[PDB]
Every structure is written in structure tokens, then in C-alpha cells.
Paper text:
Broadly neutralizing antibodies (bnAbs), capable of neutralizing diverse HIV-1 strains and subtypes, represent promising tools for immunotherapy and prevention. bnAbs target conserved epitopes on the HIV-1 Env trimer, including the CD4 binding site (CD4bs), glycan-dependent sites at the V3 base and V2 region, the gp120–gp41 interface, the membrane-proximal external region, the fusion peptide and the silent face. VRC01-class members, encoded by the immunoglobulin heavy chain gene segment IGHV1-2, include a five-residue light chain complementary-determining region 3 (CDRL3) and are characterized by high somatic hypermutation.
In the 01_D03-complexed Env structure, but not in the unbound BG505 SOSIP structure, EM density was observed for residues 57–65 of gp120 on the adjacent protomer, suggesting that this normally disordered loop becomes stabilized after antibody binding.
Residue numbers in the entry:
A (entry chain B), B (entry chain D), C (entry chain F): 519 to 546, 566 to 663
D (entry chain E), E (entry chain C), F (entry chain A): 33 to 57, 65 to 138, 147 to 185, 188 to 306, 309 to 321, 321A, 322 to 397, 411 to 460, ...
Write the structure that this text describes.
Amino acid sequence: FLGFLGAAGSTMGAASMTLTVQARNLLSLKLTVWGIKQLQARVLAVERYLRDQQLLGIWGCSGKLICCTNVPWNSSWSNRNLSEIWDNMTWLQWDKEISNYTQIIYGLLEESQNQQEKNEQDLLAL
Amino acid sequence: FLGFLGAAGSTMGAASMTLTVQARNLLSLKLTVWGIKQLQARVLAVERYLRDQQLLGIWGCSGKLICCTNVPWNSSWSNRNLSEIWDNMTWLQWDKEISNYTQIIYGLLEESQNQQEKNEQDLLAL
Amino acid sequence: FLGFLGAAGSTMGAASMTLTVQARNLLSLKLTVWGIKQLQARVLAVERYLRDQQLLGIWGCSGKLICCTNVPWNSSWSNRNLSEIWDNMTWLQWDKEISNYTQIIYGLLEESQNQQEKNEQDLLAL
Amino acid sequence: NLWVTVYYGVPVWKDAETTLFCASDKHNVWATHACVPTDPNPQEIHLENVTEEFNMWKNNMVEQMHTDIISLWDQSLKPCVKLTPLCVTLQCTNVTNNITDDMRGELKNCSFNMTTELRDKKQKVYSLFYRLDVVQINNKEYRLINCNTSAITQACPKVSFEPIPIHYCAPAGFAILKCKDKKFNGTGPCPSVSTVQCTHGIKPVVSTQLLLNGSLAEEEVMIRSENITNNAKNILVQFNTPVQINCTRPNNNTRKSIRIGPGQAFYATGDIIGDIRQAHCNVSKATWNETLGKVVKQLRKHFGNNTIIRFANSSGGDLEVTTHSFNCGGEFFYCNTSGLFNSTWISNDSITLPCRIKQIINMWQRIGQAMYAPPIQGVIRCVSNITGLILTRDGGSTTETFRPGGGDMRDNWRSELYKYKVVKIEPLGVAPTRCKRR
Amino acid sequence: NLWVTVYYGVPVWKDAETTLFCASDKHNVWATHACVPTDPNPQEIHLENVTEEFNMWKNNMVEQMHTDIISLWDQSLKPCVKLTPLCVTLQCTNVTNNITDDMRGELKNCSFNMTTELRDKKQKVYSLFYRLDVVQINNKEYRLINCNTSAITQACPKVSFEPIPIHYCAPAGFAILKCKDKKFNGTGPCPSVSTVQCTHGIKPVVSTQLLLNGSLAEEEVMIRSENITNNAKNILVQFNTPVQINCTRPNNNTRKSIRIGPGQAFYATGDIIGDIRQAHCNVSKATWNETLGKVVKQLRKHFGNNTIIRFANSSGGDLEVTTHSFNCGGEFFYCNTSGLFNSTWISNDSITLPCRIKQIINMWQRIGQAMYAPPIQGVIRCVSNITGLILTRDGGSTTETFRPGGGDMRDNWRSELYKYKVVKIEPLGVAPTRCKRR
Amino acid sequence: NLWVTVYYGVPVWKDAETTLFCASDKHNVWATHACVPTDPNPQEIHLENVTEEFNMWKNNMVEQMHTDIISLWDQSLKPCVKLTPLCVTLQCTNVTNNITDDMRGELKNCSFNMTTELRDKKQKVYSLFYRLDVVQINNKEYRLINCNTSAITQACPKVSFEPIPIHYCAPAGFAILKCKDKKFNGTGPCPSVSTVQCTHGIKPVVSTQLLLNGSLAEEEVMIRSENITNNAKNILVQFNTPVQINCTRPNNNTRKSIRIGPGQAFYATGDIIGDIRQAHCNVSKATWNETLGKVVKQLRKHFGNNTIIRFANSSGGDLEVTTHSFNCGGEFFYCNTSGLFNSTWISNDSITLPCRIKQIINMWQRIGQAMYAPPIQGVIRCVSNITGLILTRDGGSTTETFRPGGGDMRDNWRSELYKYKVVKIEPLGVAPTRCKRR
Ligand SMILES: *[C@@H]1O[C@H](CO)[C@@H](O[C@@H]2O[C@H](CO)[C@@H](O[C@@H]3O[C@H](CO)[C@@H](O)[C@H](O)[C@@H]3O)[C@H](O)[C@H]2NC(C)=O)[C@H](O)[C@H]1NC(C)=O
Ligand SMILES: *[C@@H]1O[C@H](CO)[C@@H](O[C@@H]2O[C@H](CO)[C@@H](O[C@@H]3O[C@H](CO)[C@@H](O)[C@H](O)[C@@H]3O)[C@H](O)[C@H]2NC(C)=O)[C@H](O)[C@H]1NC(C)=O
Ligand SMILES: *[C@@H]1O[C@H](CO)[C@@H](O[C@@H]2O[C@H](CO)[C@@H](O)[C@H](O)[C@H]2NC(C)=O)[C@H](O)[C@H]1NC(C)=O
Ligand SMILES: *[C@@H]1O[C@H](CO)[C@@H](O[C@@H]2O[C@H](CO)[C@@H](O)[C@H](O)[C@H]2NC(C)=O)[C@H](O)[C@H]1NC(C)=O
Ligand SMILES: *[C@@H]1O[C@H](CO)[C@@H](O[C@@H]2O[C@H](CO)[C@@H](O)[C@H](O)[C@H]2NC(C)=O)[C@H](O)[C@H]1NC(C)=O
Ligand SMILES: *[C@@H]1O[C@H](CO)[C@@H](O[C@@H]2O[C@H](CO)[C@@H](O)[C@H](O)[C@H]2NC(C)=O)[C@H](O)[C@H]1NC(C)=O
Ligand SMILES: *[C@@H]1O[C@H](CO)[C@@H](O)[C@H](O)[C@H]1NC(C)=O
Ligand SMILES: *[C@@H]1O[C@H](CO)[C@@H](O)[C@H](O)[C@H]1NC(C)=O
Ligand SMILES: *[C@@H]1O[C@H](CO)[C@@H](O)[C@H](O)[C@H]1NC(C)=O
Ligand SMILES: *[C@@H]1O[C@H](CO)[C@@H](O)[C@H](O)[C@H]1NC(C)=O
Ligand SMILES: *[C@@H]1O[C@H](CO)[C@@H](O)[C@H](O)[C@H]1NC(C)=O
Ligand SMILES: *[C@@H]1O[C@H](CO)[C@@H](O)[C@H](O)[C@H]1NC(C)=O
Ligand SMILES: *[C@@H]1O[C@H](CO)[C@@H](O)[C@H](O)[C@H]1NC(C)=O
Ligand SMILES: *[C@@H]1O[C@H](CO)[C@@H](O)[C@H](O)[C@H]1NC(C)=O
Ligand SMILES: *[C@@H]1O[C@H](CO)[C@@H](O)[C@H](O)[C@H]1NC(C)=O
Ligand SMILES: *[C@@H]1O[C@H](CO)[C@@H](O)[C@H](O)[C@H]1NC(C)=O
């Protein structure tokens, strides 16, 4: 155990060891100068936490720290080998080079969950 | 893709094709006239989104856009055929005629989830 | 049906019969004296509910009223028999006498969830 | 083998302090229009098997109500006329026309130069000020009582002072525990607890010696004290039956609008039509004597059957403490409650309490913010029940004397929030069950 | 066999009222900087197959916008100079040098004693007040019009009154339905409904008889009324083409800064450089006649082809309702508009409307809060389009007369929020699918 | 075959601006009681392997602190006595009893008519005003310096000016990255990052030329500038060791309460008991010379070893920027500090700085909101550390001269928020993995 963002500089596999220690710190009077700043900090934390949880639920990954999906890696986002990604590279470096493919990746996860959920309903209806 | 409420006039089946596009738009300073109105809108959106998510979790349907359950559909609620519902009718018309049976349906979904979860605990206990 | 906290004095088993009635009541203008109090009450309720849901989801129990897990009963937390616990005792007394092992129990649930999610991902990779 | 099981929604609560919002079923001082509409049918659940510890003297609901009532009072006086030009020298003569014996010198006919709408002009106006509002400077020269101490703000005449019941409702995730025990003295276990979303209609009635328009005890007169053996602790008596008191202001007063600036009007007192009589309160002699007989019967339990219980009047202090101060129809009375607490108890007719009127009011024992209560046109008459007392005992080493108390307004609302308690629901619980996660 | 099935995210909405926040694309009165930055590309979605009911006269957006505009106006006048020393006796003479016949007696040269920065010293200054701001007291003695009624607050000169478009945006979980029907009335079903996140730029233009700076009808002049058969309901006309009105205040006015206290400056009116002419507005005679010809053509539909439609001027009342009051570069004009509504209709040139300026302004039909509009240096000129009218009909049992109306500002913004509607998205729906929970 | 795998809770952050609330471990101006109680044991996590870019000159934390500090100052002056009646002609005589040569003409014995609590009665009172607070009008006639510029509000005597440390804590989902590098200038990569929930106790000390009560550099004197080659950019020096400064006000002043209205008291200055001496500050000559020897040693690195570094005093401007203005015990000193920056540098004793006192304070370089600091009874003496400087260089084409600077208070708190930055945690990450959803 290292603490909040303890594995920030650790490798991806080592960072995935303690994904929860950063997961539980994303959520946790008069109208004076400090009271208003305190109130808008509480509402901002609630909204920011809820937006990520909604995205996970949209992709069918709510309640799971690690979730596998059914959308392919296009090999244009990143062609790096798996060994050097999880043993020689950190999460901060990952987002830097894939900051622009994020939205298209998110959209792919969106349709995959809805497509397979219709398939689950149709298969189960038999 | 049609956008937010794009399938509002679509049939039941076509509307269910894009349940996600309406699902993601349900969630996303000084104490001036506009600041308070903008703050009240932020808190109102959060507690409104959380109320529907809580209901889905109560019925055991959190994280699923389409969830099937285990309570019968009484013909008193609606005796219309399946073919003419999902191919000749829109979601606006559905709620209009079943706005009164909604609460009793919600209670039935409430008890089914708790009853089946007791069964899951007892069956697994063996 | 008894209502909110209807089974407060009932036994463990009777209380578990109707966890949902208490589960659904945990979540549900001008800057005058009453308006700010109402707004702060709304925000406080929202964040308390979200903290509880986050703790549930950290242990992999989101969307489940009864979730049973993979960390042992240390026998120092309590050594009472199951029959007398679930037929002759109440949740108030349970919490009263296990108010101090709560944090270590929560940490054990956290680590168990993370370890089993790692195991699931590794087994699914095959 | 016992694997822990986490349960959500378990009925567990812990004692906590939170912000309770208002619910309520012409504008008002307490903005009950800003309170959320309460449900037509309150939902109360009887918590069987449950025994919860209560404490009215450590209850945070009383302290929170005190802040809310003061804040509501302060915010209703913000958009109101500031009577800062009224601190001017007054030439006051006694109102001696058509007055009775008890009103000799109580009313003052004060004339003063007053600012008009135009900044460069002055008007010579007159007003009728009670003797308790003007203090002599050494016809004679007077001045308002507050003028060395506070800046006076005239209460807006369109804002009603009538106490509208308010329900203090806890947010989601919190519950309010209601003691159903009818013999409960405010401290200790409560074998009969019920959970309600929020409290009954608690009228913010402001009074010092008698608890007016309150909640009656179900079975017997209840004596409630933080420490019955301590004479520095006020004794809160609650009546099982109401004692009716009519309080009237016989003077047919007229409100005169003096325009003291652009958009600012100071409502003075014109001449009274008819004779000038003393404001007073009726108390039934038979009903009051019976109630004291019940109070002493329930008071001998904590002091012995052979003790001598004597009721004497207020010892001394401010007029707010020595008199039954209350608000009746928008005017503040200060009553001579010495014919009530007069008897000594050993093992059709009415009691008239001569009250005095004040217009400059210092509420909540605050020094710095006075209020001018504008005159009420006509004759004021209000009917209320005395639903309790605030008695104070005197030290001794065979007789016990009980004088009236007051001053602290938290004791007034403590008599309504005694049965209620705010708890924090804890829906997460862990128990060992024969499960194992898959 | 049919088991229920819960669907999340279904496109279902219900009519509801919510708080719509502002979005906007020198400080302004309406604080459009405090509005959240709207998206560069609005996301508008067409809802085909959808027929939704609309009613612009029970629309809550209009009522909500009225409160926001008043609240925005009130909050911009809080940190501004309070001109309470201005309520003093004035010695006013007529401004008779280099004036025309139409300005004889309209301007008053008022001299008065003003408090300076030092409390004990007085300052004899003069200012030019319009005849509509000073009322005689019975050179002669005058006083500001509001001195018996309201406390005047000088508008801060660095805050502009120019209407900046504001977009009323609904929170998440709410949608705004926009009727794209180009022949859409104010009430009834709209075959062509669409969802947009929030409305177009709605300029909060304040005017009484003519709707300026507005939104034009797509195809034809649209006549909208709550009840066309009721003469007590205003008729909201909307123009398919804009009528250009040119409003000027020819005087070369100078703002003179009089320092009435520590940190407080009262901006008076100095002498005009040059001659003094009457403020006026030009409306093209050919363009105005053509628009009335289109209005009567669309007005005969609700009143018959053989009816006689006559346009008479405003009936009696306040200057706000009897004149085309509006705001032009910080100065408030009050234009007669008696040559506009002048003709009777049976089955290069310009119209000059003589306007009158006011500096003490009472808007929102509120009594008690006046505002002093400081003078604007130089010559003011405005170019606007008349995009509508507010007509009022007179009762009768063969001719119909239509007089201009106004007063209520909600009718001015109802002409912009007629096509919009706030709905409450309900994403939970239950359907009987054959699927059964395993 | 690779499948997109989503991870929650990954340690990824982005630079962002957010609202940081206060935490803190008599009432203060900074309202540290309204700050939430910080944890007794701060939780700092060292982020090994991490190298993050910092910039204190583009740091939003400094800008947000400046707005909060001004807002806290403004909100503590709202419920305080407004000294608008003080703007009156003063008949000031020269305080010439028991004065030294350095205090000749610095104190003025001003007498003026004052308003009494009674509106129609005046009050001839006297007070002692420093020569920097009264300006002559052309015994002689004087007036307060602010009367032609600002409305003066008396600081509430019960509110403390003492800087209480405040911790700026980021909300959940945000982190504050503490740079733990000891040789770190404000700009560039810092390969010793750590994540602390929120900053150390940062005292909002208000000073211009010397940074008092601050945080010392860990190893060596640090010279930090936005652009060391630009002479228009202030140079922030940080001392590795503190230089103690003794600051005293020898005059035994007495606060005299003058009642200027109902509930309003103006705390004037009575006669000084004893002799009247000049307020001064000593800095040790030996300690100051050593610190300047270290400052030049690290100043030659950015300017060459053969350059001539000379310290000269302020160049001119307001008294705030030309003097070491600071607050000591409730009184605002303005110390010369010309004997500090006086030497030139080539390859027991104390320095007494003659300070001057002001009571009318225009702070934050704002024109319009003056404050009256009430006199402090007795003798004021405070001991501080000079933990830094604000030097300004002069342009040239072999010697470099460094004069003290100030004025902008953001430079004062930038020396404390240099090591911190606010980042936005992004817990969602996607990475290809052999795992596939079943
Ligand atoms: C205790 O409760 C009683 C009943 O609510 C209160 O009596 C009422 O007091 C109000 C004024 O506080 C009286 O209102 C006045 O009524 C007249 C006639 O309609 C009207 O002209 C006045 O403007 C005003 O509204 C009301 O008549 C009176 N009625 C009864 C039944 O007594 C009593 O004041 C309360 N005591 C307290 C708050 O101490
Ligand atoms: C830098 O820090 C020092 C120490 O924290 C500050 O000196 C302190 O200043 C306060 C007043 O601002 C002194 O408190 C006062 O003490 C006197 C005498 O006991 C008392 O009569 C007052 O009521 C008040 O409590 C405190 O003693 C003093 N500490 C010392 C001299 O060691 C200094 O002001 C700071 N520099 C600043 C704020 O510029
Ligand atoms: C309180 O009681 C007194 C008497 O005990 C009332 O005063 C009498 O009122 C009646 C009219 O109702 C008169 O005829 C009598 O002359 C009054 N005096 C006496 C001595 O009887 C008084 O009105 C009562 N207070 C009320 C009704 O508010
Ligand atoms: C207070 O005043 C009420 C009247 O408002 C009195 O009630 C009346 O009492 C008489 C005699 O008992 C009855 O004849 C009337 O019918 C009652 N009127 C009612 C009930 O409306 C009451 O007695 C007075 N109380 C005291 C102590 O004098
Ligand atoms: C409005 O129209 C009038 C004419 O109808 C304009 O007055 C004329 O102004 C010109 C200068 O541009 C003079 O040469 C004429 O002598 C004026 N005619 C008169 C006074 O009858 C007036 O300038 C127009 N105002 C505008 C366009 O703002
Ligand atoms: C600052 O230093 C000066 C001297 O440098 C101090 O003044 C001396 O004070 C003592 C009393 O403590 C006298 O005996 C000396 O005669 C003074 N020297 C002079 C006037 O030259 C002064 O007290 C110091 N102030 C502090 C430490 O606050
Ligand atoms: C930093 O990198 C080294 C190897 O370069 C690695 O062994 C170490 O674990 C990393 N730090 C952390 C905290 O993981
Ligand atoms: C509208 O109706 C037509 C025919 O009824 C249908 O083909 C079309 O799909 C509908 N619109 C949508 C969005 O489904
Ligand atoms: C007026 O009343 C006062 C009591 O307030 C009294 O002292 C004085 O003698 C009276 N004057 C008369 C009755 O003339
Ligand atoms: C009003 O002022 C005049 C001024 O001399 C004075 O004579 C008169 O007595 C005053 N009237 C009062 C104080 O009622
Ligand atoms: C109230 O009842 C409790 C019940 O145990 C008792 O302990 C307590 O002494 C009582 N209080 C008084 C004042 O009698
Ligand atoms: C001054 O103007 C007024 C109009 O308000 C008019 O009645 C009066 O006759 C004028 N007097 C002169 C001398 O012009
Ligand atoms: C100012 O006051 C003096 C006082 O006598 C008066 O004569 C003069 O007319 C006043 N000036 C005005 C009212 O303009
Ligand atoms: C009083 O002090 C002032 C300094 O502000 C000086 O100008 C003046 O000459 C002094 N007067 C005497 C009589 O010393
Ligand atoms: C106070 O006012 C009187 C009025 O005449 C004047 O004589 C005196 O000098 C004033 N005193 C001051 C300004 O100190
Ligand atoms: C500041 O530090 C950075 C990194 O250590 C370095 O690159 C730079 O040269 C230094 N000086 C300035 C003026 O940025």
C-alpha cells in the first residue's frame, strides 16, 4: 500500500495492483466566502464522480475496476508491444499519446454494449 | 444516429436501438442571479439522475439499458398485441395509457428483486 | 410491509426481509433562510447516498441488497452462534458491538474484491 | 466457516446533528411560504422492540431552532424602514384626557421635528409613545429608549407576527425519532420509539413565563428539569389540560402614517377614540387554581409529600424576565403575573393581569438591534391556552418556593422538541453467513 | 406469457417547470458574463412523427424570464449611488436659449443646494432636468417626481443597458421543445416539434407599443391572442418583414459630475452645445403603410372580410402605456406614436414621432424603486426594427378599432418564447417483452 | 488480437483550475472558523518516478488566493461602523508636548463637531490623527485624506487582523502536487513531485518590500523571477535563514469611544500617557549583512561573477510601494527601509527603520473602499522574520542595481504557492489487453 496516487510513477501492471486506492478518493453552513467555496466544491466532486460512473455503466462496466470489452484496437491508436506497455511504461505516458483517440474509442464502447445487450435479450427470449 | 431524443417519434423497436443516446444526456462561481440559477440546475440534475439509477438498482437492473424481470404483465394494464406495439406505436403513447399502473408495476419489480436475491443467497449457501 | 425502519426492532432475518424499504428512502429557489437549508439538505443526502453506493461498489456489491463475499470471520470480531444472531438479535446491537472492526473488515473486502477481479481478468485472458 | 456478508438498507441509526429544513401545510415573519409543502398525510412508523436514549437538554434541534427563528426574524427586518431619524429630542406631555387610574402617566404625547421627503425641510409631528419607550433627558424633554444603544428598525406592517406551525424535516439518509412514552421526563430510555419523517406543527410562540399555544401532556402534568436538585436549572412544567387566557388592549388606537423620507413612512400613534384603559389578561380563577393543584401534586414527587410548595412572583431583573412577555396581534404585552403565582400549598371569577405595552422591542436578548412595532388599528384581543410554565426554584436547606422564569427562548421551544431526536441512518452492515462469493 | 421489461433512456417527456440557466456567446445590466459560455454549434434535433401541445400564454418560461430580468435589474442597481440628497427643493427656470417651438418648457434649469464631501459644507449646483422629472410645489420651486414615492438610485454609468442576447438553457434531464411550424399559432398542437438544448438569443428588449429588435415571422404576419373574441386580451402581432425605426436625441448633452459625498458622484446635465431640438423617431411612411396592409389582411381572418379595421392611437393612462417607451443608448425615450396608428381600412417620406426623454424611471410597474439614468454625452442615435405590435381591441356589438397596448413586459418576451416549451425527460419505461430474467 | 480494456481509478491527472476550499487547524478577518477542520495528520504521498512541469507565474492558486483574501477582507467590513459622519471640517493643532525631534508635526490634535445619538444635537469632540491621514484645506482647517476619494468604514475592533494559517484544499477528484525539489525555481520540471490533499499553513501576511512570517528555503537563498533578463519583472528572493525584525510603536495610545449615532461608536485617539516617540523597526546589522551577502552570491549566478550588484532604496510612488508597509497588532506601519537596501557589493548593532503610522487604509490598491483602523491601546511590539524580498532591477547596457518592490500582493503569496499545483484526476483509462468480454 502506497496511498492515493501511490502508483502514479509505477508501471501499468503495478498501477493496476492498487486501482482502488485512487477509486475511493474521488468522492470524499452559511453563505459566507468560505461557505460558498465549500458548497461548490462538494457539488463539483459529486458531478465529476457521477460522470465517470455513468460512462462505465454506458459501456457495461459499472461496479468493476477492470472491465474487458468487445471493440478492437485499431493499431493506429498504438502499435506498441504488450510487454513494454505494462512493464516499461506508466499510465501518464499512456493518456498523453492517446488523448486524441479517446472519444472515438469511447463511441466504439458505446455501441458494443448496446449491441450485445440486444443480443442478450434476443438470445434469452428463446 | 439521430441525436438526443432522435428516436422520440420512432417505433418501440427503433427507439430501443438508441437507448444510450438519451441515457448519457441526463447528467451533463458567485451567488449572483445567474450563479444561483446555474447552481440549482446542477444539483437538480444530479438528484434527478440518481433517483432513476436507484430505482434500477432496486429492481436489480443497474448498469443495464434493457433489463428483463420476473413479474407478470397483467392484461388489465394492456391487452395490445406485441406486433402492433413494437412496430406501430411510440414510447410517448405507451406511457400515456400506463401512467396509472406505473406505481403498482414498480412495487411488483421491487418485491421480485428482493425475493430472488434471498433465493440466490439461500441456494448458494448449500 | 411495515414502512421505513419498520423492522428496526425485528430480528436479523425479518430485517433482511425488507431491506429495500429502507434502501429506497436514503435519497428521496431563493437564497433565503429556509432555501439554503433545503439546498444543503439535498446536497448532503446526495453525497451520503453516493458514499454508501461507492463503498458497495468497491467491494463488488453494487446493485445488490445482500452481497456475500470472500473474507473470513476472524472469530475475534464475534463468536456468537448463527441461530441466536439471526433469530434473537437486532442490527442495532450488531452494529453496537462491531462498531470497531468495521474499518478492517472494509479493507479486507476491498482487497478481496481487487484480488478476485485480477483473477477473473487473468482467467478470462485465456 | 463463516464468510462475511454485506447488507444494504439495514435499519441502523446513530445520533447525529444535521440541517433540518422547514415544511408548512399574507407574508409572515417566518417565511413559511419558503418552506416546502409537507405531505397531506404524514407517514409515521411505530418502531417495535426499540428502546432509544433521549435527552431534551442536549438536543441539537432546540439549538438549531433558536438560530433559525432569530435568522428569520433578522431577514424580515432587512427590507423595512430604518427609524434612525426618530432619535431626536422629543417634547412629551402626559396623556391625561379620558384616562383611568391605572393609565396615569403610561402614555406620552411626544412632539418632535421630523425630516420630510425634502432634505431641506422639516415637519413638526406628534405621536403617542408609551412610558416604557421614552426616557427623560436630564413639557419635559424625552428620547427613545434605544437611542443610546441600538438602531431601531420599524417592523414592516404587511408582515404578520402570527406563529404559523413549522415542521422541521430531516434530509434523506436521516430520521427523526419520536418518543411515544406519555410518562417521559425528557431524559433516559424511551421504550416506545416511533420514526416520523418530521415533527408536528411547532408554533414559534415567543413567551417568557407561561408557555402559550403549545402541546399538552397526554396523561398528567409533567415536570421536566435538567437537574431537579439544582436551583439554577429551570423547571419546565407541561399541562395536561389547557388554561385559557384572553388578553386585550382596550384602547382603540389609530395608526398615523408620517412620511419621513422618499419612500419611507413611520407609522405613529394617533389619538385614541374613546377612553384609555389598561391592557390586561383574563385568567379563570377556578381553572388556574385547579392547574396549580395538579402542578403541586406532580411537584411533590421530586420534593417529598411533606414539603411546603409556595408559588411567588418573579424575583427581579429585566421587564422581559419579570413579566409574561408575549406577542398578541402584532403588539407586545408585558403582564403583571403576580396574581397567578401567589399561593402557598400545604399537605366564574377571573384573575386580571395588568399588562404594559411596548413598541421598541429588543428580541432574543440582543443588544444592538431594536425593533419598532407599528401600532395596530382598533382593539386587540387574542385567546390562547397556557400549556405550560417555566418555574425557577430558590435555594434552601422545609418549604420550597417556585418563582417564574424565562429570558432564554430555547426553553420555550425545548418544550416542543423534547420528544424528538435526529438520527443518522447507517444502511451498511456486515454479518457472517454461510455464503461464499461464487 | 409476457413478463415486464424495464427500459432506461426511453424518449419520453412530460410538461414541467424548472430553473433554466443563462448562456451567452464593459459590464452589462443582465450580467451576461455570469452566463455559462454556450456551445459554438448548437445541437438541434428534429423530432419527426411527434405532435406536441403548446400554449404560449400559460408558458412558464415567460413568467420565469420576467423574474430574472427584474432580478438582474435590481442587482445591478445595488452597488450604485443612492441619490437621496437629490430630494431637495429646486429653483428651476425654463431653458429658453436656442430652443425650438417643440421644446418650449420641456427642459428645466434647476439650481439647488447639495451636500458636498464635507458634512458641514453645502454646495450650490445646477442641473438640467426634463419637465417630466420635476413637479412643482404649491423662479418657481420644483422637486423630483419620485421624492414623495420612491428612493432614487443613480444607474452606474459604466453598466450598459444594451440588450445582449441570452439563451435560457434547461438542466440535464430536461429538454426544450421548439415548434418549427411556420404558421404556428400560440395555442394548439404543433405537427413539427424539435428538441434543442436551449433557445436562440432572446434580447431582453424593453418596449411597450412596438416590439423592437425582435424575431420575425418566417412566412406571414402572425396574429396571436389568448382569446381573439375577448377585448381584454392583448393581441400580439408579429411582422414577417422588419420596419426600421430611426430614433435620435439631437441635443449635445454634457454629463457634469457633481460630487455629493465621499466616493459618491451625481452625474448632472450641463448646458447643451448648440441648439436644443426635440427627440424623435422616423418610421418610413411607405414601409409602415405596407406593414399595416399586411396586418389588416391577417387581422380580417379573425374578424371577417367585410369588417372595418381602424387603427387609433393609445387611450389614456400612464406615459409608459400611452407612449412607445424604450431605451436608446442609455436614455429612455417616450415616443407618441399617434401618427402610426392613424388610418382606417375598408374592404421616401417619413413619419416623425415626437418623443420625450425621462431620467427618473419606474419600470416593471413597481412603486417604490425609482432609478436615475445618468445623461449620455453627445448625440444619441438608434436604428431598430419594429418586429411586432401589441394591439388592444375595443368592445363593440360593423367596425373594429385597434389601439396600441403595453405595460406588461411579459407580453414583450412572450413574443420570443412562444415556440419554446420545457419538458421533463422520463427515461424509465416498462414494456411486456417475452424476455424473462434467468 | 487486442481488445480495448477500460480501467477505473488509474493515476492520471491533468492541469486544471478549480475552487479550493479552506481548512484551518476571537474572530479573524479571514474567518478561519468557517474553514473546515483539517486533519490532525496530513496525508502526503510521495510520487516516485514522476516528473511534473510547474509554473508559479501562471499558477491559478495565487490568483484565486488574491480574490479570496480580498473577499474575506470585504465581508468583515460590512457589519462595521461607517464613518461617513467623520468627513467634516477639522480644526487641527500641532501635537507638541513630550514629542521628540522625529515626531514634530507627525501627530495632529483635531477637533470637530460630531453627530450625537440625538439627531438634532451636535457634539464637539477631539481626536489625534496622524499627519498621513489628514490633508489641509486651502489653527488650520484639515479633512480626512479619504473624504474626497472614498467612504471610510471603521474596522470592527473585535475582529483580529492576525494572519491565521489557512490550507487551500482541493475537492475530491482533484489533487495538489507539491514539488519537493529544494533547488527549484518557480518554472520548469520538478522531478520530486508529491500529492498532498492540501497545502501547508499559508499565513496571509500583507507586506510590500519584505516577505514577513513566511516559509524559508530549505538549502540556499533562492532567486525566482518570471524573466530574469526583463527589468519589468519583480524578483522574488527567498531566505534560507530568517532575519528577525523588531517592530514597536512606543506611544502608549488610548482608545476613546465617541458615540456618533444610535449603536455606532467611533473609536478615536486620546492623549498619549508619557512621551511620544517615533515608531521604528530594528533589523540586526550583522544578520542583515550576511543575508545580503548570500543574496548577492546567488544573484551573481544570473548576472555574472564580475558584475557589480548594488542595493538602492525605493525609486518612488505611493507610500505603500516606497515603504515596507505591514500590519502589526492591528496598526499599519510604513517603514522607510532605506538603511537596508543601501550598500554596494563588489568581488550587536541594529539598523533602526523609521516607520510611520496610518489609520485610513486603502488596501489591495483599490480606490473607493477605505478603512479606518481603530487605535490599539497600550504599546504595540511584534517580532517577525524577514523570509524574503521583492527586488526590482533597473535597465542598463557593468553594475546592476536592485531596488525593493511591492504593491501587487499576488507577489507576496506566490512565494508560498510556488511549490503547489492543482491537477484534475482522470480515473478512466483504456488499454489493449488479451482479455475479451464473454
Ligand atoms: C394563540 O392562538 C390563537 C388562535 O390562533 C391566537 O388568537 C388569534 O390571534 C390573532 C392575532 O395573533 C387574531 O388575529 C386578528 O384577527 C382580527 C379579526 O379577524 C384581524 O382583524 C386582525 O388583523 C388579526 O388577524 C385572531 O383573531 C385571534 N383569534 C383567536 C381565536 O383568539 C393567539 O393570538 C395565539 N397566541 C399567541 C400567539 O400568543
Ligand atoms: C509574525 O509572527 C509573529 C509571531 O507569530 C507575530 O507577532 C505576534 O503578533 C500578535 C499580534 O499581531 C501578538 O499578539 C498580541 O500580544 C499582545 C501582548 O501579549 C496582546 O496584548 C495582544 O492582545 C495580542 O494578543 C503576538 O504577541 C506577537 N508575537 C510575538 C511578538 O512573538 C507578528 O505580528 C507576525 N508578523 C506580521 C503579522 O506581520
Ligand atoms: C377580564 O375580566 C374583567 C373583570 O374581571 C373584565 O372587565 C369587565 O368587563 C365588562 C364587559 O365585558 C364590564 O362590564 C365590567 O365593568 C368590567 N370590569 C369588571 C370589574 O367587571 C375584562 O373585560 C376581562 N377581559 C377581557 C374580556 O378581555
Ligand atoms: C375568554 O373569552 C372567551 C370568549 O372568547 C370565553 O368563552 C366564553 O365563556 C362564556 C362563559 O363561560 C360562554 O358563555 C361563551 O359561550 C364562551 N365563548 C366561546 C367559548 O366562544 C372565556 O370564558 C374567556 N376566558 C376567561 C378566563 O375569562
Ligand atoms: C427624421 O426625419 C426628419 C425629417 O422627416 C429629419 O429632419 C431633417 O434632418 C435633415 C438633416 O439630416 C435636415 O436637413 C432637415 O431640414 C430636417 N427636416 C426637418 C427638420 O423637417 C431627421 O434628421 C430624421 N432623424 C433621424 C434620421 O434620426
Ligand atoms: C530598536 O533599537 C533601538 C536602538 O537601536 C532601541 O532604542 C533603545 O532603547 C533602549 C531601551 O530598551 C534605550 O535605553 C536606548 O537609549 C535606545 N536607543 C536609542 C534611542 O538610540 C529600541 O528600543 C529598539 N526597539 C525594539 C527592540 O522594539
Ligand atoms: C520506478 O522505476 C523503477 C525502475 O525504473 C521501478 O523498479 C520502481 O518500482 C518505480 N517506482 C515505483 C514507485 O513503482
Ligand atoms: C415516422 O413515420 C414514418 C412512417 O409512419 C416512419 O417510416 C419513420 O421511421 C418515422 N420516423 C422515425 C424517426 O422513425
Ligand atoms: C407625568 O407622568 C410622569 C411619570 O412618567 C410623572 O412623574 C409626572 O408627574 C406626570 N406629570 C403630570 C401628571 O402633570
Ligand atoms: C422644533 O425645532 C424648533 C427650532 O427652534 C424648536 O423651537 C421646537 O421646540 C422643536 N420642536 C420639538 C422639538 O418638538
Ligand atoms: C427521567 O427518566 C429516567 C429513566 O431512567 C430517569 O433515569 C431520570 O432520573 C428521570 N428524570 C427525572 C428528572 O426524574
Ligand atoms: C416655463 O415653463 C412652464 C411649463 O412647465 C410654463 O407654464 C411657463 O409659462 C414658462 N415660463 C416662462 C417664463 O417661460
Ligand atoms: C440654498 O440655501 C439658501 C439658504 O438661505 C437659499 O437662500 C437658497 O435659495 C438655496 N438655493 C437653492 C434652493 O437653490
Ligand atoms: C505643525 O506641523 C506641520 C507639519 O505638518 C508644519 O507644517 C507646521 O509648521 C507645524 N506648526 C508649528 C507651529 O510648528
Ligand atoms: C463647530 O461648529 C461651530 C459652529 O459655528 C464652529 O464655530 C466651531 O469652530 C466648530 N468646531 C470645529 C469645526 O471643531
Ligand atoms: C528554471 O528551472 C528550469 C528547470 O530546472 C530551467 O530549465 C530554467 O533554465 C530555469 N530558469 C528559468 C528562468 O526558467
